[PDB]
Amino acid sequence: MNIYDVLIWMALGMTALLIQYGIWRYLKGKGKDTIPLQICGFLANFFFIFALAWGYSSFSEREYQAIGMGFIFFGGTALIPAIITYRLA
């Protein structure tokens, strides 16, 4: 609802699509564009977008410490697939 919620959600979807396209382009450039190497990047992108969305929602709910803790946890959960993908490429 609101007028800013829908814009932020569309922006988050666009950012997720951009990150997925960038991951696929990176894999194709390095030549290792296999599906698992892309599913790992998809998981990383999903967890990063989840971190951002949870931070926004916690800001809406006036729960301000959850914004940073959610960032930390979901960012690490996203960095692990990113680290795996980078080490495999």
């Binding site: 609802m1 969305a53 949870w54 929602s57 709910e61 006036r62 729960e63 410490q65 959850a66 803790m69």
Partner: protein, 503 residues
Amino acid sequence: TSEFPYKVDAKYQRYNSLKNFFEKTFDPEANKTPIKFHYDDVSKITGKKDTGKDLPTLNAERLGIKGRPATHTETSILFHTQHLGAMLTQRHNETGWTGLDEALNAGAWAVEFDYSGFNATGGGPGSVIPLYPINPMTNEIANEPVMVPGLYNWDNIDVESVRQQGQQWKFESKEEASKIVKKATRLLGADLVGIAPYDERWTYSTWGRKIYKPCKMPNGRTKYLPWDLPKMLSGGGVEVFGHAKFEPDWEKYAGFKPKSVIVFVLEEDYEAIRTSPSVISSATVGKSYSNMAEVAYKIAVFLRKLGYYAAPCGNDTGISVPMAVQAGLGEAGRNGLLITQKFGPRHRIAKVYTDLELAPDKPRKFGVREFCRLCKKCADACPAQAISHEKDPKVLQPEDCEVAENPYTEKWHLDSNRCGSFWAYNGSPCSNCVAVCSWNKVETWNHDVARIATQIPLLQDAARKFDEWFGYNGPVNPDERLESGYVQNMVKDFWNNPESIKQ
């Protein structure tokens, strides 16, 4: 499936309503012995210092009594006097207990105080309120009030007339009857509604009404109270007058034998419960008692105009938490409270009995009781340490309960004398066990995703620990909740935020 999900022993007996903390307040025998706790010290069980062991002595000191603990009647009357506004809270020169917050609390509990008969502490069948006669010609209010029915009246005089005139509404099936009743209940103001069959196990074995005696106030008006306020203020002690006891005969007092029950709940404010110890959470609990009293009357009138008998009830005729479970509204948590999916424990339950045959709902399971076996979060946040620290629920025995608890049901044991001792100490209801609950969340996308994760095997522990770590609803520790400044800052933000928390 099945009538009741939890295990009920074959020795189960209906609970006597006069044995509870708020009803046993006004039994004169409760004024003879100091208040009793199931465990004198819970320091060993919790591993932390017991702060509630000194509550009777502190309450007795507040009452002006030296050398003995406060009694059950004295403790309850001290809370009653602090809540009524005839005294000042111990923290009145503190943010969250000031005159402004007390005024807000008094305004919120106005309808419950003056038109429900103060039904939060129970009541008889029908509710009675004292109102001062007024003269329409001169707008001159008299001094001696009269007794008139409240918002929970059981007046069913016109049902027979409706039936005899042929205007009684006939439903084609029980399913349609339940659908229409639920839709009407939701329109009239309820947040959730469920229908349960009449189960006599959840009806009290004795209905009672407190005895009120007139006492003159300095404004010149006589007010009816169940205790001697002028004597208490003068230092002569606390005196009560007893109860008027009624047998639970439905035909005598209501006119019909029930066959179905309408159970509904009303949500409480999220931003006010967050400041749980302060009187802002008391204001949001008084508003809920006002709202539930207003909605029940509308539902009863709707049922009576349909041509069927109705008996609106609040905290007086049956036990609401087991009945709401039977209606499929939620599950009973570690705190003994109904844990709805949408609101968690942020709600108040009211019921309406009727003779209309409705299709009953079924109990629901969505992971509350398995979460509660591991979280133990409400127990840590109790300033009186009343909630049990045991891992698993059990079939309660007479040895596992005091006189004020109904044994023989599979559940966790709560000490009621500690929760009343801390309300006397604080001067307002405490809601800490509701505020810190992991299910006490607003309904949004992320909280629904987390609720899905409370039943996926690997994600359960992650969701629980993340709820604990993310800091929702403030610190768990009762003492830390105050001197860390969380309650003060939350009250200041509440006053300085134009809008409440809804998303």
